[PDB]
Amino acid sequence: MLSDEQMQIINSLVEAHHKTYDDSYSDFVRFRPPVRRLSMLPHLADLVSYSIQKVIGFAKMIPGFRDLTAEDQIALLKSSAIEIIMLRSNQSFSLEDMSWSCGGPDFKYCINDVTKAGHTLELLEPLVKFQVGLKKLKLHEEEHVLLMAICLLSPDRPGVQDHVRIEALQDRLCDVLQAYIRIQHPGGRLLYAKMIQKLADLRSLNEEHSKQYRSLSFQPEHSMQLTPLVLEVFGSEV
Amino acid sequence: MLSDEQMQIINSLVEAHHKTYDDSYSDFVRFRPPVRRLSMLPHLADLVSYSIQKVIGFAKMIPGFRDLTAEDQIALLKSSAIEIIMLRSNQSFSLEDMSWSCGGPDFKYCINDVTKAGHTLELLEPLVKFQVGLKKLKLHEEEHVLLMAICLLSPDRPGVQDHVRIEALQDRLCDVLQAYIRIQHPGGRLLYAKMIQKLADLRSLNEEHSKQYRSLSFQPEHSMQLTPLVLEVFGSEV
Amino acid sequence: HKILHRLLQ
Amino acid sequence: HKILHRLLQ
Numbered sequence: 267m268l269s270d271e272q273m274q275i276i277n278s279l280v281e282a283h284h285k286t287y288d289d290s291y292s293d294f295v296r297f298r299p300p301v302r303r304l305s306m307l308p309h310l311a312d313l314v315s316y317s318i319q320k321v322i323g324f325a326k327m328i329p330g331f332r333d334l335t336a337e338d339q340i341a342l343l344k345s346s347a348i349e350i351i352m353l354r355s356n357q358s359f360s361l362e363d364m365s366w367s368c369g370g371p372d373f374k375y376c377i378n379d380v381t382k383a384g385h386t387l388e389l390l391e392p393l394v395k396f397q398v399g400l401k402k403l404k405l406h407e408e409e410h411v412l413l414m415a416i417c418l419l420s421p422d423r424p425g426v427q428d429h430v431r432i433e434a435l436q437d438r439l440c441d442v443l444q445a446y447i448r449i450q451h452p453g454g455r456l457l458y459a460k461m462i463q464k465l466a467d468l469r470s471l472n473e474e475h476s477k478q479y480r481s482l483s484f485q486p487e488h489s490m491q492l493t494p495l496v497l498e499v500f501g502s503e504v
Numbered sequence: 505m506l507s508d509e510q511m512q513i514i515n516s517l518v519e520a521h522h523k524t525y526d527d528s529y530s531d532f533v534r535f536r537p538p539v540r541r542l543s544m545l546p547h548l549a550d551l552v553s554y555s556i557q558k559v560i561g562f563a564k565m566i567p568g569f570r571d572l573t574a575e576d577q578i579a580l581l582k583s584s585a586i587e588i589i590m591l592r593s594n595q596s597f598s599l600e601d602m603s604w605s606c607g608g609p610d611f612k613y614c615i616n617d618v619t620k621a622g623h624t625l626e627l628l629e630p631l632v633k634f635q636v637g638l639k640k641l642k643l644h645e646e647e648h649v650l651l652m653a654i655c656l657l658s659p660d661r662p663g664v665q666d667h668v669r670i671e672a673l674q675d676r677l678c679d680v681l682q683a684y685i686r687i688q689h690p691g692g693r694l695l696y697a698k699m700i701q702k703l704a705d706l707r708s709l710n711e712e713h714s715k716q717y718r719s720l721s722f723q724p725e726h727s728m729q730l731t732p733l734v735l736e737v738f739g740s741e742v
Numbered sequence: 743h744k745i746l747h748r749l750l751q
Numbered sequence: 752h753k754i755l756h757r758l759l760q
C-alpha cells in the first residue's frame with residue numbers, strides 16, 4: 267500500500283499538471299502562424315516559449331521546489347526545461363500519425379514541419395524514436411507526472427548548490443513512483459527501469475539540442491526570431 | 505533648377521523607400537495576431553520590430569550613411585528609429601478614419617487598438633495630432649522621403665562621434681529639400697519651415713515613448729512580450 | 743535572469 | 752549589439 271503523505275504528492279503533482287497543460291491548445295492561435303529552411307521557426311519558437319512558461323508553473327507546484335533558493339530553481343529549470351517539454355508533449359504525440367496533434371490541422375507537426383525550425387534530423391530522429399518508446403510504455407497519468415517532477419528534481423545538473431536538499435526530494439518521488447507501479451500498475455515489473463532509461467535518453471536529447479541551439483544563436487539573423495524568454499532559459503548566463 | 509548630383513540623391517532615396525515599404529502589407533499576416541490592457545501588444549511589438557528592419561534597410565541606402573563608422577550608424581538608428589516609424593506610417597494613416605489602414609480589417613488600428621499596447625494617451629494624443637498635421641501638409645513623395653533621411657541624419661543625437669561628417673550629409677539633404685520645394689512644389693513658400701517643425705514635434709514624441717518604454721521594460725511580464733530586436737534598439741546599451 | 747526571477751515570484 | 756551589427760552587414 268501507499269502512505270497518505272505519498273499520495274498527497276501524487277495529488278498535488280496531478281493537480282499541478284492539468285493547470286499547466288491545456289488539452290484544447292486554444293492558445294496556439296496566438297503564436298506567430300506556421301509556414302510550410304527556417305520557415306516554421308517563428309511558430310515553433312513561440313510554441314517552445316509558451317511551453318517553458320507552463321513548465322515553470324508546474325515546477326512551482328512540485329511539493330518542495332518552491333522552498334529552494336532562487337539560484338537553484340533557476341539552475342534546475344535552465345538545464346531541464348527542454349527535457350520536460352519533450353516529456354509533456356508525449357500527451358499529444360500520436361502513434362498513428364507519428365506527429366504531434368494539437369487541434370489542427372494548422373497545428374499538426376510532421377517531421378517535415380519540425381525539420382524547418384533550424385534543427386537537423388540528428389536531433390529529430392532520436393526525439394521521434396523517444397516519443398514512440400514513451401508512448402508504447404502506456405504510462406498512467408500519475409506515472410507520467412511523477413517522471414516530470416523526477417526529471418526536474420535531478421541534482422547532477424550544472425549550477426546546483428544544494429545537492430542534499432533536492433536529492434532528498436527526488437528520492438522521495440522515486441519511492442512514490444516505485445510504490446505506485448507495485449500497487450496500481452498491473453504488469454509493471456519492468457516499468458520503473460524503462461522509465462529511468464527514458465531519463466538517460468532525455469539527456470542525450472538535451473545535449474544535442476544544446477549543441478544545435480548554439481549554432482542558431484551565433485547567427486543573429488535566426489537568433490532574432492526567438493523570444494526573450496527562450497534567450498534567457500537556453501542562454502549561457504549564470 | 506536642381507543639380508544632377510542633387511537629383512541622384514532624390515532618385516536613390518526614393519528607390520530606397522519603395523524597397524523598404526510594402527504597400528500591400530502582405531507580411532502582417534506573419535505577426536502575432538491582433539486581439540481587441542496589454543492585449544494587442546504582441547501584434548504591435550511584432551509590427552514595430554518589422555518596421556525597424558525596414559528602417560535599417562532604408563538607412564543603408566541613404567547616400568553616405570553606409571560610409572559612417574558602425575558605432576555612428578548604430579547610434580543614429582538607436583535614437584531615431586521610433587521617429588522614422590511614426591514618420592513613414594503617415595503613408596497608411598487615413599484622415600477619413602483617423603486610423604492607420606494596412607489592408608485589414610484585421611490591420612485597421614483605431615485609437616482603441618493602440619491604447620492597448622501598454623502606452624497611455626499621453627503618447628497617443630500627440631502622435632495622432634502629429635499624423636493629421638503631416639497628412640494635411642500633402643507632401644510629395646520626394647519630400648516625404650527626404651524628411652526621413654534628414655531626420656535620420658541629425659547629429660544632435662546621443663552617441664555620435666563624427667559630428668562633422670553627418671552634419672555635412674544632413675545639410676546636403678536640406679539644400680536638396682529647399683531646392684525641390686522652390687522648383688517642384690507650387691505654393692510651398694512656407695513648407696520647409698513646417699516640415700522642420702515636424703522634426704521638433706518628432707522629438708517630443710520620441711522623448712515620451714522613451715519614457716513610457718522604460719516603464720514597460722521594468723516589468724518583465726510585459727518585457728518578455730517584445731522581440732529581441734526591439735530590446736536591442738530601444739535598449740539603453742552603448 | 744529578469745524574466746525567470748519574475749516568473750518564480 | 753549583435754543583431755544591429757549583423758543587420759548593417
Ligand SMILES: C[C@H](CCC(=O)O)[C@H]1CC[C@H]2[C@@H]3CC[C@@H]4C[C@H](CC(C)(C)O)CC[C@]4(C)[C@H]3CC[C@]12C
Nearest residue numbers: 310311314351352355358366375380383385479496
Ligand atoms: C510540438 C511539440 C510540443 C507539443 C505539445 O507540447 O503538446 C514540441 C515539443 C518538443 C519540441 C521540439 C523540441 C526541440 C526543438 C526546440 C526548438 C526551439 C529552439 C529555440 C529553436 O531551439 C524548436 C524545434 C524543436 C525540434 C521542437 C519542435 C516542437 C516540439 C516537437
Ligand SMILES: C[C@H](CCC(=O)O)[C@H]1CC[C@H]2[C@@H]3CC[C@@H]4C[C@H](CC(C)(C)O)CC[C@]4(C)[C@H]3CC[C@]12C
Nearest residue numbers: 548549552589590593596604613618621623717734
Ligand atoms: C500602425 C503604425 C504603423 C503603420 C505603418 O507602418 O504603415 C505604427 C507606427 C507608429 C506606431 C506606434 C509607435 C509608438 C508605440 C510603439 C510601441 C512599441 C513598444 C516596443 C511597445 O514600445 C507600440 C505602440 C505604439 C503606440 C505604436 C503603435 C503602432 C504605430 C501607430
